[PDB]
């Protein structure tokens, strides 16, 4: 089935987050994990895999054992938004971001044109690019937000110019979306936020459309 689009007061409001939006911003700045054609070299818990990506140990956490079992010792590409603070390990941590390398490579990059709406109105479109036939939503989300942070100040040091935001992925009939804003209160926990990626959700890079819906204050 397709995910119902956000309800009236379902989306997090940035004005109700009173901590430093910097802690969200830094997740969608230049720093990120990207590795091509690598295989796991260790494992901590039964739902993670450790990769060597100088080389750092990257702990990739999945939602369950089935996903870790699937990719253990398979040659993959890894792409995602990593964190350090309270990274539990025994170095950096991330969730998901894993795609089989073999059979998934494109000769030429595919472009996906993000459509950006502000209060319902399309003011901006821009392309993200990938070499992958099947690509994680995480990778596409990161690339989309990276552009919006640089160019639209999506996240600033203290807060955002936007009250709400969600990113919507559409593949033919089916769609799903992520809330782009922090939960309310004075703390932002990066590990909790990023866990949304632990399902390793994948989309087809030819068919997927990306729509971002922002509201202003």
């Amino acid at each position, epitope marked *: 089935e397709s995910q119902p689009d956000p309800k009236p007061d379902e989306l997090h409001k940035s004005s109700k987050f009173t901590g430093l939006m910097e802690n969200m911003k830094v997740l969608y700045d230049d720093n990120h994990v990207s590795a091509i054609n690598v295989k796991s070299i260790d494992q901590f818990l039964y739902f993670d895999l450790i990769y060597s990506i100088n080389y750092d140990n990257v702990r990739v956490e999945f939602k369950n054992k089935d996903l870790a079992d699937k990719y253990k010792d398979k040659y993959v590409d890894v792409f995602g938004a990593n964190y350090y*603070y309270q990274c539990y390990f025994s170095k950096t941590c991330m969730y998901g971001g894993v795609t089989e390398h073999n059979g998934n490579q494109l000769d030429k990059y595919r472009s996906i044109t993000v459509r950006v709406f502000e209060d319902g109105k399309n003011l901006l479109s821009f392309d993200v690019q990938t070499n992958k036939k099947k690509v994680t939503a995480q990778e596409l989300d990161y690339l989309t937000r990276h552009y919006l942070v640089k160019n639209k100040k999506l996240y600033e040091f203290n807060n955002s110019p936007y009250e709400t935001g969600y990113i919507k992925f559409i593949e033919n009939e089916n769609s799903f979306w992520y809330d782009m804003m922090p939960a309310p209160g004075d703390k932002f926990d990066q590990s909790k936020y990023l866990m949304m990626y632990n399902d390793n959700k994948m989309v087809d890079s030819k068919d997927v459309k990306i729509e971002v819906y922002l509201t202003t204050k």
Partner: nanobody, 128 residues
């Protein structure tokens, strides 16, 4: 291995200007808030200034605000401090300090104890 090496600084008359430079190696500067702290004779460490990883946000101690400017160049892995309108009270060893927390900012401005590496330091003297 993590290294911070301060250079520049020096001796100047009151009202003058100096510049400090810190070359970072063994880590990516871009992951870290960076700070300048100083230690004047017979004093404890004093926080002077901080800059976030991006470069968009700077903070200064009251005593130096409007006179000093912190900046960074992540590509060159360097932190800078411009010291203008110097006063005798500014005489001190100056140290470049790295946040203990990659990709995370618990407090702004940062606390002195939220740094975990320092260089050997560079002398600034405003000669009386």
């Amino acid at each position: 291995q993590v290294q911070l090496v301060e250079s520049g600084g020096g001796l100047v008359q009151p009202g003058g200007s100096l510049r400090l430079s810190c070359a970072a190696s063994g880590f990516a500067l871009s992951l870290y808030v960076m700070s300048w702290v100083r230690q004047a004779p017979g004093e404890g460490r004093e926080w002077v200034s901080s800059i976030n990883s991006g470069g968009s946000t700077t903070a200064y101690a009251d005593s130096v605000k409007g006179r000093f400017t912190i900046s960074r160049d992540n590509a060159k892995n360097t932190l800078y401090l411009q010291l203008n309108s110097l006063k005798t009270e500014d005489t001190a060893m100056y140290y470049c300090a790295k946040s203990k927390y990659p990709k995370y900012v618990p407090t702004w401005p940062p606390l002195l104890d939220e740094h975990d590496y320092w260089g050997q330091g560079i002398q600034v003297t405003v000669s009386s």
